[model samples]
Target: GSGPYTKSHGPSHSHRYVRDSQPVAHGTVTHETQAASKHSNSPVLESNIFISDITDDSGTHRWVSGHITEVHDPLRSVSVLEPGGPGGCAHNHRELVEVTAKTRKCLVAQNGGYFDTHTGQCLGNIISDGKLVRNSGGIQNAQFGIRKDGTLVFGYLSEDDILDQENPFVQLISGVVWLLRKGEIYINESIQAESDKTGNFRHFVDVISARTAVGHDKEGKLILFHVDGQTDVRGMNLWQVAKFLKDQNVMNAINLDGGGSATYVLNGSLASYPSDHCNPSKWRCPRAISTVLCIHER
Candidate 1:
């Protein structure tokens, strides 16, 4: 686990990649090389860009994502992962993965934003296919999305407004903390000191656990990333994750639901580390989540 290797993340080895062809018809998905691992899972058509992952800090961070100059690009895109109508029975990340694979076929998949554990109600504003789904207004958390113009955007749907003069987004989801703004760190700098002093469930600047995030680089390529706690005791915090993404050239970023909710499904198999799992009778895997980020192809 500490040396260069080639690993498959699918449920079966029957999942062959589309590398022999120049690019898939849906959109070009090219295989890329991670510094620590050789990934032969996906590809890109533009000749230089591809869908891949990179492991950093030895094993703390593994960021896998895609690129699209516009939402209408001939390349891959993200899909809605609302399993039960945004406010119903929670489904595991694998359900979302299966739906995506059966319908559109995804390159990567990650857990989405915060939700009520007891009630299983999503606390984020959501949109699908250019239509609004759940508007979790009245909160102060961060809203990350891809606008109708195909540009990555972030906003806060406060108690007063839904968008509040923000760009019209075609796809929108929520996140816990807005980490990066204009390439500058915000956790405790502009994020301020507000955690540990309260129980609002939204102020942990130094909480360590598995983490999930979505952001774009300076050149606007989308990245779906996560952090594994290695052994239930070591992982990055809000500030550490923000700094990591920033160093990786992420101009804007948001930390999504982490802890046991952090998941990464590439090609079809569960990719990331599952810190917490479901029932004792069920599979010992990631928790049953409310939403997900399906990095899908055309």
Candidate 2:
């Protein structure tokens, strides 16, 4: 994290302010050891905290921060999009953040309600550049889960889902990541049986086909998400994405948005989801409106 900057930069130009850039570093980044706790019933989840927050911004996004309290069913709540004002209502300030695990697989989504995630208030949108952004829509999707120890566990689905045929990135980047406690990371992709009702297993991270990877990373202080790309998804009723994190030595993980508009928010920055220009759907679909993402100090 950089220190406070002077406002002497003057007026900012039309640019995509790059938020959350990973710090490139030296040799093998050996994992650290997370403290043991009573939060996770299992040895893996026992000691960790899932920390999600929006970064502070001086220009567009400022003083925005919150945490993921719920999981699954992304986009359940959030302020609708507004064309003007700061973006959403003064209180409706949500943003998006994109996170990719060291390993690549299906993407999971996570987000909070449309309202003020920090204050839990109903807010209006902010208008700028001749647009009325009633609310900061589509910042994120789904609620993020917190292990007893506070480790964060996120979820994602495969864009090439064979079950239910539900596209996780319909509106944004649909992927999974376990934003481990204190800079820890773990991720994976698991395929499940397609839903007969939809004639396509397009859905990701379903309970019936959820898989679990087992292991602990006491040495690294991080637990891994089990069931890596090589995990067998056959004949499984449901799959737990976090199990894969455990195998990866990630002590804690959170589930992100998996289907349709699952969002990630970063203050002032637009949202990111696993999206593709050409979707392999049989019929044209309606554009999903609105999304939510976590925010932090600018």
Candidate 3:
């Protein structure tokens, strides 16, 4: 079960990725490819980067999957686009695929930050296309931002203290800071200690649940991660996620909304196991989300 956006812990298909009005499949097909399988249903018919499944040798049941895409051109790398544009508001949720389809050159997408369940306006600190959509303060002690050069930064920011004027933050989205710095874990003691806490608190820090995160490597390649929880035997916690990414040579990683809100869409298909709907045989059901982080190339 997942908690409401009430300050609780948060957090595919590729059929045809049309480039230049022509059908193009970037990667080569392999035997491991689920191409003909029902699980292979995705809106993206091709992938430009690499995709893989993850498991730990530390002796625990872990089912994790992710997609890694390399952004070569900084001009066409990453952009945070809103379906309703800046200042747009709604009460209903929008599917990730639907929003992605509206944009051109999009390859992958994941759910964004918390928002009003009534108004559907994003409640976090958001900057899209160099424009601040919602300048309102984000969750207490939870901060995440996207640099103009495609770097993902996670840290703690108080309500009154926001961005630095010198920083080139083009796309900023807020989330709880699980791992604040490279070597430090607890950026806020109170937040790390409370399970029944409100916004920006890390509840179930060690307990297994669905998880999602965005990280950048030393080489500047961006990574999007998702772990299967609830449906699977076990899901990873905050510490586990941090350690895993660190071991994988990830730098400046931040946790995003998880639980049932943890959704990954590639090309146009659901890529991970979500708890909202148990019957995959029936259909793919992803919870409607307010904002989303998308990867595209133009």
Candidate 4:
């Protein structure tokens, strides 16, 4: 049997910038292998990580890329990484190396969280491997997170959320736009946009470009959603992205940082044509990103 997976990244954290963590979710999150039917009902995937692309007839999206990542058997298969440690809160840093799988199972990786391209500081609240990485108190947006209950959720990191010891976030990353909730459209441009404290991407209902998101299906398996655009695909707007995810039966989802930040790497290699490359055949032209979320062989 494959060993269990855990959430993690490089170790370089100290309390220098991070305030004392308010509390652990006190979730008593238990990680143990589960029987198949208990966690899954669909047959298109399984416990391992799978990254693939698709050609769609949906018009707005001719090319789509995604990851089917299972966070169980151990319940911690997915983890978040940053230029340094999440807690370091460093700026102007880009992960200079290509994402390669340390194991043959797979390393499903992509750009994560929002930040100012000019300065390089992550703008959203971050919880990586159970540590309070960045606490943007005013930043309000839906985030894809694993709770203390050892399950996944798409919610906000409000004052009570971060300080709540009972069900706090264990592994979390903020997405600027609240696209879908319970498989329904939730992108209220003005409300969601102004509330998007850091991204300034409020209600981008009409804008089209490269986009990325993290959400899960009815069974709660994590899904990484990306659209190839800003080059040849014409990309899609938040509405289009939300529609595609809902069609895929994704119950909850949020828009991650996109535009030039759309990079899809498989088995430690770039797989999609990022608009940053401009040329469909270009290689080694990924944006200097600050955060990454990945899954590895346990």
Estimate, for each residue in 15-77, the C-alpha lDDT of model 4 and write its tens digit.
211122212231222111111112433332342322334333464324444444444322346
Best by lDDT: 4
TM of each candidate vs. truth: 0.65, 0.24, 0.67, 0.70
Better of 2 and 4 by TM-score: 4
Span of 10 residues, lowest total lDDT, candidate 2: 1-10
**Candidate 3 overall Cα lDDT vs. reference?**
0.52
Q: Per-residue lDDT of 1-298 in model 3, one digit per residue for the tens?
A: 3433344332200112111211123132100100111112333223332233445556644445544433433224456656434434333344453454346445677776755554555665777767776665334434566555444555544333345556566776766544424433432432432223334233445456777776555554455666656522467777767776676676556677777677777766676666666466655466766667776654
lDDT of each: 0.52, 0.25, 0.52, 0.56
The top-ranked prediction according to TM-score is 4
Residue 199, candidate 3: C-alpha displacement in angstroms: 13
lDDT at residue 59 of model 1 (Cα atoms): 75
Please report how far candidate 3 places residue 247 from its true position, in Å: 1.2
Pick by lDDT: 1 or 2, better one: 1
Q: Over the full model, what C-alpha lDDT does candidate 2 score relative to the true structure?
A: 0.25
For model 3, where is the 10-residue window of minimal lDDT?
29-38
